[PDB]
Design a protein around this nucleic acid. Structure first.
Ligand SMILES: O=c1ccn([C@H]2C[C@H](O)[C@@H](COP(=O)(O)NP(=O)(O)OP(=O)(O)O)O2)c(=O)[nH]1
Ligand code: NA
Ligand code: NA
Length: 326
DNA sequence: GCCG
DNA sequence: CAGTAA
DNA sequence: CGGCAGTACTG
């Protein structure tokens, strides 16, 4: 359906350069425009037409028309030579633009440089060991197998636990970057202490191979981010994210964890225009903010038993997970 | 970068 | 806290 | 001019 491939391919290069150099708001603008172009019904053929599309302004319009007339984009030719190396480094899990830029300034140019000379955090060393694996997407059928491994282990010590795979899986994608498993209990209390029992059970059977984020000390753990691998030959290491939530938060946690990320941001932005606030925990009304958009007063939580309730309270038509890519 |  | 991530 | 989402770990 992308009727503007020659344009977007060039804009994506520029967008990625801004992102990895840390100019996140400018990169957000490019991401907004690129999506608007991927979804326009026709080839965009004029400056006046390009401007009419939400997310495209005068500046983006004159880049589009430069591409159309000449097949090239002058700005690409002056992208810093550092950008491919910065992208290489920031694809290490646990390293972002700041770390990538420091490693670059220190003279490193390759993952061999990083391995042999760089200071690495515990997470980054795991990211580097699984560098290729964390860039691959698994078939969704393997995500099912991972969800079932987690569900069988959780339900072995409490059969009442509800487990649901979210993210790209629940949105129906053919491949998945990780598996996002949401766990809750329909009664309202038994979700306490389950992380400790769950993670121990998945470690005893050899399924978890490394931990990236897991605060197991004080019992208030909300998320586990780590690495798993199914048994047998031909298996890769896969990213696993688990969250455990109170039942009263199930609809908002499901909404958050199904995403997409841009869908969540657009929904939360709409809530803010209404004096409301939407998080993974709750939809709140009568939220008080200052002129900068920052919360200065808490509001009150609205009951949201189902995802449909959240849309309804925001004045929105319900959208099925497969329709939430943007 | 866009846009209110 | 800054950095990174979901 | 200035916001662009709202959260949870790490050290
Ligand atoms: O910045 C973010 C990132 C993720 N999220 C939510 C939405 C996202 O779908 C969910 C899971 O995050 P993932 O990184 O797993 N993204 P997703 O599952 O959609 O795609 P994939 O895992 O296949 O890359 O967390 C946000 O709200 N903000
Ligand atoms: Na990274
Ligand atoms: Na995911």
């Amino acid at each position: 359906t992308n009727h503007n491939l020659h344009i977007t391919e060039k804009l994506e290069v520029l967008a990625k350069a801004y992102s990895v150099q840390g100019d996140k708001w400018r990169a957000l603008g490019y991401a907004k425009a690129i999506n608007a172009l991927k979804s326009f019904h026709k080839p965009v053929t004029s400056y006046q037409e390009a401007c009419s599309i939400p997310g495209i302004g005068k500046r983006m319009a004159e880049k589009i028309i430069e591409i159309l007339e000449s097949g090239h984009l002058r700005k690409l030719d002056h992208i810093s030579e550092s950008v491919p190396v910065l992208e290489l480094f920031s694809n290490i899990w646990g390293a972002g633009t700041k770390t990538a830029q420091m490693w670059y300034q220190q003279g490193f140019r390759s993952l061999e440089d990083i391995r042999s000379q760089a200071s690495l955090t515990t997470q980054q060393a795991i990211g580097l060991k699984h560098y290729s694996d964390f860039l691959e997407r698994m078939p969704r059928e393997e995500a099912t197998e991972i969800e079932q491994t987690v569900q069988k282990a959780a339900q072995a010590f409490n059969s009442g636990l509800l487990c649901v795979a979210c993210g790209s899986y629940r949105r129906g994608k053919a491949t998945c970057g990780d598996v996002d498993v949401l766990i809750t209990h329909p009664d309202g209390r038994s979700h306490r202490g389950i992380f400790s029992r769950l993670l121990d059970s998945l470690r005893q059977e050899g399924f978890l191979t490394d931990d990236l984020v897991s605060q197991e000390e004080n019992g208030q753990q909300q998320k586990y981010l780590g690495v798993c691998r199914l048994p047998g030959p031909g298996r890769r290491h896969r990213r696993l994210d688990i969250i455990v939530v109170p039942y009263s938060e199930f609809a908002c946690a499901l909404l958050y964890f199904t995403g997409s990320a841009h869908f969540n941001r657009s929904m939360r932005a709409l809530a803010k225009t209404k004096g409301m606030s939407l998080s993974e925990h709750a939809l709140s009304t009568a939220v008080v903010r200052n002129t900068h958009g920052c919360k200065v007063g808490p509001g009150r939580v609205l009951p949201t038993p189902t995802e449909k309730d959240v849309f309804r309270l925001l004045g929105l038509p319900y959208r099925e997970p497969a329709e939430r890519d943007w």
